[PDB]
Design a binder for this molecule. Structure first.
Ligand code: SF4
Ligand code: NA
Length: 214
DNA sequence: AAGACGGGAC
DNA sequence: GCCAGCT
């Protein structure tokens, strides 16, 4: 594992490759963000944006979603994949907003997790992006990056990764940091073929060196 | 707690 | 013919 100073180093380095890193899910309000992320599970942001482009014009409120039969909503998000559970989740999710959350989107991370299709990662993205509540959402790109660079053990839970990062990054930079990591991994340290050869972090990256040899 | 859910880049 | 998080 890397020292805290080296992880701070690494992050700072990522903050130079991606100064304007941000959430790529296109949204206009917390409600649209929430649906977007839910639709995100095991799916590219690019594709989600492609679909919500039209989806968010037909549906704009929790009442709009629960007004149509499951079938319809399913076809509206057919391209996404996992559209059955997602369609059922969204409708139930919208019902809850109405029944227990005064028709709005709750700003409490744990509360969000009560929503179907909304896990910790999803809940963290929402509080942080929509509500400014510092939080580190650990997703495929954050987990991989953390593990290859040695931010943590190759065997830690996403939760352990989250706690690890929280211990390091100042509360004030969790969100932005998280975003830079996503970018660093989505666009550089890519799962399929990482750009190790030109990686500013190859010098302290066990995964890079290992990949360079092989 | 493994398994089930279901367009794009090689 | 691997990559993008509830029961
Ligand atoms: S060296 Fe390679 S594997 Fe390590 S962070 Fe850079 S691109 Fe990722
Ligand atoms: Na949930």
């Amino acid at each position: 594992m890397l020292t805290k100073q080296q992880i701070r180093y690494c992050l700072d380095e990522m903050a130079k490759m991606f100064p304007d890193a941000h959430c790529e899910l296109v949204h206009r309000n917390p409600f649209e963000l929430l649906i977007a992320v839910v639709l995100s599970a095991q799916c590219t942001d690019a594709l989600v944006n492609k679909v919500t482009k039209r989806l968010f014009e037909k549906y704009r409120t929790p009442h709009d979603y629960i007004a149509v039969p499951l079938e319809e909503l399913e076809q509206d998000i057919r391209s996404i994949g996992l559209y059955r559970n997602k369609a059922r989740n969204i409708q139930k999710l919208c019902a809850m907003l109405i029944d227990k959350y005064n028709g709005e989107v709750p700003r409490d991370r744990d509360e969000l997790m009560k929503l179907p299709g909304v896990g910790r990662k999803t809940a963290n993205v929402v509080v942080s992006t929509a509500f400014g509540v510092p939080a580190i959402a650990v997703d495929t790109h954050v987990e991989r990056v953390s593990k290859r660079l040695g931010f943590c053990r190759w065997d830690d839970s996403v939760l352990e990764v989250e706690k690890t990062l929280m211990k390091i990054i100042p509360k004030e930079e969790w969100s932005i940091t998280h975003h830079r990591m996503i970018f660093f991994g989505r666009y550089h340290c890519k799962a399929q073929s990482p750009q190790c050869p030109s990686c500013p972090l190859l010098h302290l990256c066990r995964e890079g060196k290992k990949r360079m040899r092989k």
